[PDB]
Amino acid sequence: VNSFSGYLKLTDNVYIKNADIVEEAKKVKPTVVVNAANVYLKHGGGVAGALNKATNNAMQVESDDYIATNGPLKVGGSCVLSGHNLAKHCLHVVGPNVNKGEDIQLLKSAYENFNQHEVLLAPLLSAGIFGADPIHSLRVCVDTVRTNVYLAVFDKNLYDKLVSSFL
């Protein structure tokens, strides 16, 4: 038993809710919240900009130190940093950005990072301003992640479309 509430169960291990991931993280304080990161951990917009704003920019300060030490992530890769006031940990995962021409096949590699964590609160990778089809992202999630994932979908219209079209 965990504290996630109001989710629709899609499979044995994947759950989905129309929710603001920031507000959901603040209330659950999950062990892991996933950020929709880029390779530079520049949290300007989308989910990343919203999560970082909710940390009063502490996520960005920590991220800049991480990059200065380690260099950029790989597309499809991840790193574990602090969850600040939102979660114990933040798993920064880089899905491919279609608006940069990155290979969508890397989306599966991106979701594989979730398997290193027993339970996660997450957005759909490569959705929103990353330009991929969210229906496809959900399919890859279900077919790749084996650990327990609670997906927060901000847009109500998209949430309904994702549920109604789910096979």
Side-chain angles (χ1 to χ4, degrees):
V1 181
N2 67 52
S3 151
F4 288 104
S5 178
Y7 287 74
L8 175 70
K9 181 172 182 57
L10 295 174
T11 68
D12 181 62
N13 66 298
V14 178
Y15 295 79
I16 194 164
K17 184 185 180 176
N18 175 215
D20 183 349
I21 193 170
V22 172
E23 288 309 314
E24 191 76 9
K26 280 198 290 189
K27 144 181 135 43
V28 176
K29 292 294 239 81
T31 304
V32 180
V33 66
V34 173
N35 181 33
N38 58 54
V39 297
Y40 306 110
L41 302 179
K42 286 172 61 98
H43 309 303
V47 166
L51 291 169
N52 176 59
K53 179 178 178 184
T55 75
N56 183 43
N57 211 50
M59 178 180 284
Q60 191 64 67
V61 169
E62 181 195 28
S63 292
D64 287 350
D65 171 82
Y66 172 91
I67 296 288
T69 299
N70 300 108
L73 294 181
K74 302 171 180 182
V75 179
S78 69
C79 66
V80 180
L81 291 172
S82 180
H84 300 278
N85 54 313
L86 302 178
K88 185 174 199 301
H89 300 107
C90 180
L91 180 70
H92 295 272
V93 179
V94 184
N97 188 327
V98 174
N99 305 315
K100 302 172 175 179
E102 299 170 345
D103 165 25
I104 196 57
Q105 301 295 137
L106 288 169
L107 187 54
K108 187 172 185 75
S109 300
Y111 275 116
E112 287 171 343
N113 295 285
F114 290 24
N115 289 322
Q116 300 295 317
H117 302 278
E118 287 188 8
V119 182
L120 315 88
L121 171 63
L124 286 168
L125 298 180
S126 297
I129 68 174
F130 281 62
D133 177 3
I135 294 168
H136 175 66
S137 183
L138 178 55
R139 187 76 255 167
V140 179
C141 181
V142 160
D143 292 342
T144 305
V145 181
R146 297 177 301 283
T147 55
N148 292 141
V149 56
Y150 289 83
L151 295 169
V153 177
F154 182 59
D155 186 61
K156 169 59 159 154
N157 183 292
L158 172 61
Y159 171 85
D160 287 348
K161 184 194 186 109
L162 286 167
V163 170
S164 290
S165 60
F166 184 70
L167 226 195

